[PDB]
Tab-separated table of C-alpha atoms and ligand atoms in Angstrom:
chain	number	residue	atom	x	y	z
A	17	UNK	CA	-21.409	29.577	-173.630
A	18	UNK	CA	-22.403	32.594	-174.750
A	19	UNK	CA	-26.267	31.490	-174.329
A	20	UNK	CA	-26.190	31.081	-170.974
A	21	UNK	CA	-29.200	33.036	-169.557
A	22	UNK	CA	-30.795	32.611	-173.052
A	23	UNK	CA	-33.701	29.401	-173.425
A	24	UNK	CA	-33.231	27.381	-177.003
A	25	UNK	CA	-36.599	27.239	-179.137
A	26	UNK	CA	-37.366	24.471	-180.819
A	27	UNK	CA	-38.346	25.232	-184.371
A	28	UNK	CA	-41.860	23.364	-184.303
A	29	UNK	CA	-43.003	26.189	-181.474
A	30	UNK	CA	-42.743	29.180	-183.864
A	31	UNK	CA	-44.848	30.489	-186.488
A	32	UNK	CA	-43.471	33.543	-188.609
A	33	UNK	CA	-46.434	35.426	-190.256
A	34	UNK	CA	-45.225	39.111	-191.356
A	35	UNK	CA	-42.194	40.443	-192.113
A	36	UNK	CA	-42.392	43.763	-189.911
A	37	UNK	CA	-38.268	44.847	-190.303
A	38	UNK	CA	-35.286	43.714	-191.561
A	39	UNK	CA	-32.450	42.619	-189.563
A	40	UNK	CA	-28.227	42.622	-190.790
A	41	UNK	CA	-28.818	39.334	-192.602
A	42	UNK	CA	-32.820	38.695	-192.346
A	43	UNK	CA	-36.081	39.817	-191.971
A	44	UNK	CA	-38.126	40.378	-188.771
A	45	UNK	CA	-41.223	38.403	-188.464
A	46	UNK	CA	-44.613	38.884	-185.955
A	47	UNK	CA	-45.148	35.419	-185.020
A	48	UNK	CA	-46.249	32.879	-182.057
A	49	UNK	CA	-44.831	31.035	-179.772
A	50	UNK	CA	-46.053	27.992	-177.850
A	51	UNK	CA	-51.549	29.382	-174.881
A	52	UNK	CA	-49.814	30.600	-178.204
A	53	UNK	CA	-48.122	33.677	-177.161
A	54	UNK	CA	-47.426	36.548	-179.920
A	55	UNK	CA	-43.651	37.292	-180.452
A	56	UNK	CA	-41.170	39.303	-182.746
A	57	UNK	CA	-38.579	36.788	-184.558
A	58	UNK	CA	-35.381	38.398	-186.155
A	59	UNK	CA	-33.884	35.162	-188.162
A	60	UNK	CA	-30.125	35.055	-189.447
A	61	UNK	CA	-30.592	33.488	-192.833
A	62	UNK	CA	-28.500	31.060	-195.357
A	63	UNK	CA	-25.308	32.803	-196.498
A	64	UNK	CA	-24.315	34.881	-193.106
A	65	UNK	CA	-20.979	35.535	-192.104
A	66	UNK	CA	-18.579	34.666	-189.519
A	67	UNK	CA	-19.004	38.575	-187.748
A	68	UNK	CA	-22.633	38.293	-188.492
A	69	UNK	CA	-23.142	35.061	-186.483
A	70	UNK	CA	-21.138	36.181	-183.642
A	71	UNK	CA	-22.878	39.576	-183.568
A	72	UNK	CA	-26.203	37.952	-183.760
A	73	UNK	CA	-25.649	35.009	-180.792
A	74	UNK	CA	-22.972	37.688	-178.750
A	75	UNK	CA	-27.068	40.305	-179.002
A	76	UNK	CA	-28.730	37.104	-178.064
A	77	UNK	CA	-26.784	36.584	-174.735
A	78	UNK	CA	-26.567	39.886	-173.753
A	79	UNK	CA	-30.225	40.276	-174.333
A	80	UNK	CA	-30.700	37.078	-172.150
A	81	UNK	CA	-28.537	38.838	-169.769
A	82	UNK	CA	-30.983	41.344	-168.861
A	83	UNK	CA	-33.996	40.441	-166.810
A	84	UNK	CA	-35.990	43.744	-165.349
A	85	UNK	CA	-38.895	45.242	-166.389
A	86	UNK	CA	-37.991	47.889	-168.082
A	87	UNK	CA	-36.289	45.820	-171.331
A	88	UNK	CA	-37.464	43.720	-173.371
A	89	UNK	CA	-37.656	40.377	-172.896
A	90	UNK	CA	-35.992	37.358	-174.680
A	91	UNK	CA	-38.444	34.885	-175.077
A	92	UNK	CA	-35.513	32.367	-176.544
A	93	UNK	CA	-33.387	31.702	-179.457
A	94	UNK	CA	-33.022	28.915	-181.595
A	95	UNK	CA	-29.122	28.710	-182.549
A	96	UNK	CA	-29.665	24.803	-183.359
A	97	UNK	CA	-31.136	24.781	-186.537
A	98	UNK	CA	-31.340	27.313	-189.593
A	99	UNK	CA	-32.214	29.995	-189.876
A	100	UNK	CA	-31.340	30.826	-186.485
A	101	UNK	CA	-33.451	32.962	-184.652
A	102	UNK	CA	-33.751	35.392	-181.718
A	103	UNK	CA	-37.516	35.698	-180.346
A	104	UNK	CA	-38.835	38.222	-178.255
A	105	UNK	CA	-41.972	39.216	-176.431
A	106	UNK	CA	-44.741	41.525	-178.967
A	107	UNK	CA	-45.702	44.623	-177.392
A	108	UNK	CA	-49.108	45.220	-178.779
A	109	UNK	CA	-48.718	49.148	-178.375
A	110	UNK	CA	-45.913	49.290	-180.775
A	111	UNK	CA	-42.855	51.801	-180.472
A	112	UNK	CA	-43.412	54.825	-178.598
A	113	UNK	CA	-42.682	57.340	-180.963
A	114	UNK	CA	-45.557	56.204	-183.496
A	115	UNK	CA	-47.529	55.340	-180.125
A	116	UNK	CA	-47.227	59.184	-178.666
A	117	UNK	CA	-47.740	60.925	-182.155
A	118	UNK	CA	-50.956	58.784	-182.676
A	119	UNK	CA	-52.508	59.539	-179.231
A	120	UNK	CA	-51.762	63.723	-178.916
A	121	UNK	CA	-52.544	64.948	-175.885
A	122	UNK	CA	-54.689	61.936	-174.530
A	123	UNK	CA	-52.450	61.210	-171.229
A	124	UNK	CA	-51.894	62.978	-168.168
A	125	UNK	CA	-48.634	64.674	-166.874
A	126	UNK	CA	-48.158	61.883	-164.563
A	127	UNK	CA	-49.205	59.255	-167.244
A	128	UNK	CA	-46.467	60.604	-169.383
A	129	UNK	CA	-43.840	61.044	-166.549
A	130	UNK	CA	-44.497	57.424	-165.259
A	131	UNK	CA	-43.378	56.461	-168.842
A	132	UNK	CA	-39.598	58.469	-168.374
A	133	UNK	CA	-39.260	56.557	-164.912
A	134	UNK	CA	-39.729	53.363	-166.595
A	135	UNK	CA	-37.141	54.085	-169.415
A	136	UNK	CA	-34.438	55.943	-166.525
A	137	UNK	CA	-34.927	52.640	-164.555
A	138	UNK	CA	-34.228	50.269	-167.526
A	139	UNK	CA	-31.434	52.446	-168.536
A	140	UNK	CA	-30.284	52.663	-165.164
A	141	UNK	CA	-30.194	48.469	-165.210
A	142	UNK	CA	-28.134	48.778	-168.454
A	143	UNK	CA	-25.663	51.192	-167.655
A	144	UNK	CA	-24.999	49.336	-163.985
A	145	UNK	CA	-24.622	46.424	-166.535
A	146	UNK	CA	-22.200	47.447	-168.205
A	147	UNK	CA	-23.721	48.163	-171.648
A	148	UNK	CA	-23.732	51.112	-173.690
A	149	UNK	CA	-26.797	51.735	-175.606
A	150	UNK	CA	-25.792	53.904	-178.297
A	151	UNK	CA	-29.118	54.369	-179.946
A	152	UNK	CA	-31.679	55.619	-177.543
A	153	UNK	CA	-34.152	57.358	-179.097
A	154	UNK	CA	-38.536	56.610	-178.528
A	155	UNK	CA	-38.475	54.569	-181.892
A	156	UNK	CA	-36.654	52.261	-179.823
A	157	UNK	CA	-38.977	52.024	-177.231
A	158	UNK	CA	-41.640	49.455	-176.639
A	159	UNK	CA	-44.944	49.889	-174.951
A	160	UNK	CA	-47.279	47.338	-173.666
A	161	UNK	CA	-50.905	47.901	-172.673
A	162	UNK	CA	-49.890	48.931	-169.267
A	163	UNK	CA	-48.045	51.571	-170.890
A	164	UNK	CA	-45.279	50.306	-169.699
A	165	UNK	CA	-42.145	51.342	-171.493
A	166	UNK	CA	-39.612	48.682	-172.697
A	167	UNK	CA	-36.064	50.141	-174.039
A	168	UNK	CA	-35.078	47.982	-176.822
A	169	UNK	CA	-32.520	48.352	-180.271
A	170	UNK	CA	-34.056	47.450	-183.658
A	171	UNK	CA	-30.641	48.154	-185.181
A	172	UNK	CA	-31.588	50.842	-187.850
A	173	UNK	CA	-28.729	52.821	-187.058
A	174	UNK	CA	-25.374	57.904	-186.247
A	175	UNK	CA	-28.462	59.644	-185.018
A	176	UNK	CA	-27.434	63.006	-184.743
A	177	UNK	CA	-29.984	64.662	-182.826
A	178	UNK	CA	-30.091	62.035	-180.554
A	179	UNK	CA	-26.572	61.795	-179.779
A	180	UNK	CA	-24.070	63.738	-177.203
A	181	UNK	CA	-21.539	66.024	-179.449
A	182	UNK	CA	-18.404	63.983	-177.694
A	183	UNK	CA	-20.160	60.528	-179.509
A	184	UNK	CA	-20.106	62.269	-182.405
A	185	UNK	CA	-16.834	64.240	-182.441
A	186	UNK	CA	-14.793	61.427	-181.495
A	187	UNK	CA	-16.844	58.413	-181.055
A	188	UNK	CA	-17.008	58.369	-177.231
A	189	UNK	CA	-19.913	56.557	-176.084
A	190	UNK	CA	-20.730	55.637	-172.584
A	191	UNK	CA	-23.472	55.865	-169.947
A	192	UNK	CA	-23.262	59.480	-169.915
A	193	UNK	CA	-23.909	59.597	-173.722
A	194	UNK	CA	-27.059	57.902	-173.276
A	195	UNK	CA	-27.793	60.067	-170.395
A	196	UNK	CA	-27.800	62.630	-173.048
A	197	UNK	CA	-30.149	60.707	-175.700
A	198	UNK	CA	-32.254	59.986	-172.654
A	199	UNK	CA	-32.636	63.920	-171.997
A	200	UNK	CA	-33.943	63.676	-175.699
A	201	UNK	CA	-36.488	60.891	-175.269
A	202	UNK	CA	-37.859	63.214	-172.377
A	203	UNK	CA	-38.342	65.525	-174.826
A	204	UNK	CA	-40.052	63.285	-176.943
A	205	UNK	CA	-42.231	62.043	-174.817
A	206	UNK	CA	-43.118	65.386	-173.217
A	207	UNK	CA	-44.354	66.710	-177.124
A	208	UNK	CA	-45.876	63.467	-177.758
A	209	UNK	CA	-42.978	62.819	-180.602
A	210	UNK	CA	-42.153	65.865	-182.035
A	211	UNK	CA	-39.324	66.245	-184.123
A	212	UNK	CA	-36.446	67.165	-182.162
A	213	UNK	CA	-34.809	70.346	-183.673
A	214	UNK	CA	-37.647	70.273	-186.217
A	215	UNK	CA	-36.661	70.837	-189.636
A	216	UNK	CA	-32.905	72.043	-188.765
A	217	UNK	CA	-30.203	69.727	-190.765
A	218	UNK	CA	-27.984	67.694	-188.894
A	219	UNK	CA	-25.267	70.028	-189.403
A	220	UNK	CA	-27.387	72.942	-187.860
A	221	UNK	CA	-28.121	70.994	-185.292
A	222	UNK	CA	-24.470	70.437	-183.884
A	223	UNK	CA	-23.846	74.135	-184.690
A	224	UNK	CA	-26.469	74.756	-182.650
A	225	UNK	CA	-25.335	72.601	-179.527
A	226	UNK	CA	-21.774	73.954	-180.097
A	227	UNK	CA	-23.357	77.378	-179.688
A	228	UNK	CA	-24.660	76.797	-176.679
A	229	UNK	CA	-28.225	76.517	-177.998
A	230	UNK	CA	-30.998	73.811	-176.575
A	231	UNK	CA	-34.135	72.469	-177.006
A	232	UNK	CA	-36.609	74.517	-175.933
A	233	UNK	CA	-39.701	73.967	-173.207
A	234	UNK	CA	-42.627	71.672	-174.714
A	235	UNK	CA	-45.851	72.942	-174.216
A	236	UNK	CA	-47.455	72.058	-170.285
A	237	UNK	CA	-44.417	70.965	-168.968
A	238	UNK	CA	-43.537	70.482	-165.723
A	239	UNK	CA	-40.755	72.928	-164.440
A	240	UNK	CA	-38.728	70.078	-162.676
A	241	UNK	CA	-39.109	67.896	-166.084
A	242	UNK	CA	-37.239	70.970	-168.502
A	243	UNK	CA	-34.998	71.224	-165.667
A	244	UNK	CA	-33.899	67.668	-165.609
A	245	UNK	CA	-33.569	67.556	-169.086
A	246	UNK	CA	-31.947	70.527	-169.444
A	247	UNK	CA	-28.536	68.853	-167.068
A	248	UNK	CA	-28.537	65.727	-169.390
A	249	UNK	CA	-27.612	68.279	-172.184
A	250	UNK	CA	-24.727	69.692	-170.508
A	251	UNK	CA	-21.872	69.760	-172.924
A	252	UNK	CA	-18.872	68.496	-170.332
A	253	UNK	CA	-19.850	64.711	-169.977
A	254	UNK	CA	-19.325	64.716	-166.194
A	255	UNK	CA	-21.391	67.276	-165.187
A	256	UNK	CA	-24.391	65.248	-166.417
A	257	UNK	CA	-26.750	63.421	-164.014
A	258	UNK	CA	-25.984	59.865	-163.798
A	259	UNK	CA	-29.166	57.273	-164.899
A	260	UNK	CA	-29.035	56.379	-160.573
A	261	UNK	CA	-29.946	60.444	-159.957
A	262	UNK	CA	-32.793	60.678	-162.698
A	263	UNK	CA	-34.543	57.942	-161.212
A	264	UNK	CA	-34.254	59.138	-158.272
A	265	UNK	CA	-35.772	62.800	-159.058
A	266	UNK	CA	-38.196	61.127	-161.360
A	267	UNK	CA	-39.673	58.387	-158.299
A	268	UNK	CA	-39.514	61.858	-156.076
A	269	UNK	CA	-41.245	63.525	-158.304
A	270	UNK	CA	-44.124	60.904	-159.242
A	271	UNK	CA	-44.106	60.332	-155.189
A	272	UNK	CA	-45.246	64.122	-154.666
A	273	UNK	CA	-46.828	64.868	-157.944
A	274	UNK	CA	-47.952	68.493	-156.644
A	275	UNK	CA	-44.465	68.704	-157.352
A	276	UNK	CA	-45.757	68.711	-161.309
A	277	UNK	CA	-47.982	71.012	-161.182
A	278	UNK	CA	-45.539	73.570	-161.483
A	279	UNK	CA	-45.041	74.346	-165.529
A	280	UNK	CA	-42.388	75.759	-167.448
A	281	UNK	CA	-43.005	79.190	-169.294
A	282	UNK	CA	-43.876	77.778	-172.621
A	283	UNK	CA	-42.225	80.031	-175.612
A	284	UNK	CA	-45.103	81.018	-178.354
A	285	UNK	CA	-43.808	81.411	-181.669
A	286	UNK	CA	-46.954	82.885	-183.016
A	287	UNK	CA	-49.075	85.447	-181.133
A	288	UNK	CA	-53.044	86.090	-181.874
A	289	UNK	CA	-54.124	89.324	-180.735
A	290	UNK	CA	-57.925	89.407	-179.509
A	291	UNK	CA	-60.393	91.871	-177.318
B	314	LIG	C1	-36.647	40.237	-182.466
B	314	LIG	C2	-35.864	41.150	-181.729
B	314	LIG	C3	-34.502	40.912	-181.515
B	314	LIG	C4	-33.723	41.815	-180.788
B	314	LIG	C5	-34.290	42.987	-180.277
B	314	LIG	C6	-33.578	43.909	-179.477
B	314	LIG	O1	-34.223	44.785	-178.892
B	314	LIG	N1	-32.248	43.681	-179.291
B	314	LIG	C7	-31.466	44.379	-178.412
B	314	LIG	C8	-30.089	44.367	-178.639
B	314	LIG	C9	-29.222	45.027	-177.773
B	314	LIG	C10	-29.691	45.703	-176.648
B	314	LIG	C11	-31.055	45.720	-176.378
B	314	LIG	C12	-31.540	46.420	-175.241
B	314	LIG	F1	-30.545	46.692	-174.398
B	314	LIG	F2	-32.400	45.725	-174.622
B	314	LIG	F3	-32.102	47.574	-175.603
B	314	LIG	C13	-31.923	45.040	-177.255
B	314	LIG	C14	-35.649	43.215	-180.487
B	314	LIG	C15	-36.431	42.309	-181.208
B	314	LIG	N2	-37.754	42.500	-181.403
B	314	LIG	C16	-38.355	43.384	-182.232
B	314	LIG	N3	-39.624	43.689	-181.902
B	314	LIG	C17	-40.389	44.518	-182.619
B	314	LIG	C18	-41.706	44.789	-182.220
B	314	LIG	C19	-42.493	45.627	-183.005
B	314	LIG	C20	-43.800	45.907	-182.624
B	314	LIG	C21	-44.311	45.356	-181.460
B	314	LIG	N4	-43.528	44.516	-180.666
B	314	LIG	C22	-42.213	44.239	-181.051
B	314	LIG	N5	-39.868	45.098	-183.709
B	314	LIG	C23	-38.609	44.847	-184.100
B	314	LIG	N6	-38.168	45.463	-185.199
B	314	LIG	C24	-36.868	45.254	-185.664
B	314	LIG	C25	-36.021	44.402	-184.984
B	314	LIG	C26	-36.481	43.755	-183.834
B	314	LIG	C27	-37.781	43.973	-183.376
């Protein structure tokens, strides 16, 4: 029952070629699906456990669950035969943190903004779904060659500088939390993956945050961009935007993009004096 928006596979259709990650009990595989399509494959191999099966069909039929364009898509699973497996679509792009750093500077403010209005609307989707993220972040983010943005969870996590101080003090983590992590991935995206915090240790980090301290403008951003960010960081939970108002700004904003030309005043650390 728990497959219920999910397809079943049969074996014969799938190739596994390279291991590209590991999963909690077996390695993730490019492959193809059948005309052959290319797919990721995340297999669940000979020895599992009892948890580790129901974790790995319960992520298979939430992730069939989903259908929008913002999230990845479940191509299938097979559950039938061993090792099981959980197939997705292969975004040829790659994640979006590897995908920004490698491509500095080569989009436009709007380019870059239509990517955060894909990932608010998938988010959006989730959290009026009911689920919790937990682990947003642009390494979890898949891009296609439309540059479309795809919110996904390769399971490699607590990501501190990701992650809203009540998660980490005492393990609260809701919509709002993500809302938080989401203010990060605009930061990301807006510095083309730079390092949030830089080199500051975790602990400096939430000593920071306690302080009162945030991130500070990327370079050629637009004012209403910082701005939004800057409410997902607010410390008290409800005083953050929910995912429905940062779509909304972000469509509003992409709707009237004069309304981006408008930058925030960038700090320089360095100074060059010349004539
Ligand atoms: C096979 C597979 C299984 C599950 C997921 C996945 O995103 N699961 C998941 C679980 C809970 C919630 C969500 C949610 F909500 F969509 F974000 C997704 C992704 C994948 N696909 C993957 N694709 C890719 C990948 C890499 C490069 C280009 N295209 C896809 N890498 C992966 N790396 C590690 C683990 C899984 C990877």
């Amino acid at each position: 029952a728990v497959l219920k928006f999910t397809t079943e596979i049969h074996p014969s259709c799938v190739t596994r070629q390279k291991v590209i990650g590991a999963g909690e009990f077996g390695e993730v595989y490019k492959g193809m699906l059948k005309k052959e399509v290319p797919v990721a494959i995340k297999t669940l191999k000979a020895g599992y456990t009892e948890k580790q099966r129901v974790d790995f069909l319960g992520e298979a039929g939430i992730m069939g669950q989903f259908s929008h364009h913002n999230i990845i898509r479940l191509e299938g699973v097979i559950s039938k035969y061993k090792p099981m497996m959980i197939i997705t679509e292969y975004m040829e792009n790659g994640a979006l943190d590897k995908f920004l750093r490698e491509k500095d500077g080569e989009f436009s403010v709007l380019q870059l903004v239509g990517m955060l209005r894909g990932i608010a609307a998938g988010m959006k989707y989730l959290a009026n779904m009911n689920y919790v993220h937990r682990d947003l972040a642009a390494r979890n983010i898949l891009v296609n060659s439309n540059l479309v943005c795809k919110v996904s969870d390769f399971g490699l996590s607590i990501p501190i500088r990701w992650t809203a101080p009540e998660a980490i003090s005492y393990r609260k983590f809701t919509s709002a939390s993500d809302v938080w992590s989401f203010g990060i991935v605009m930061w990301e995206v807006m510095t083309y993956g730079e390092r949030p915090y830089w080199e500051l240790s975790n602990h400096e980090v939430m000593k920071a945050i306690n302080d009162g301290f945030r991130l500070p403008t990327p370079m050629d951003c637009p004012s209403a961009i910082y701005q939004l960010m800057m409410q997902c960081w607010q410390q008290e939970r409800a005083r953050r935007p929910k995912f429905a108002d940062i779509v909304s700004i972000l469509d509003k904003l992409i709707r009237a993009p004069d309304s981006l030309k408008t930058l925030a005043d960038f700090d320089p650390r360095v100074s060059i004096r010349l004539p």
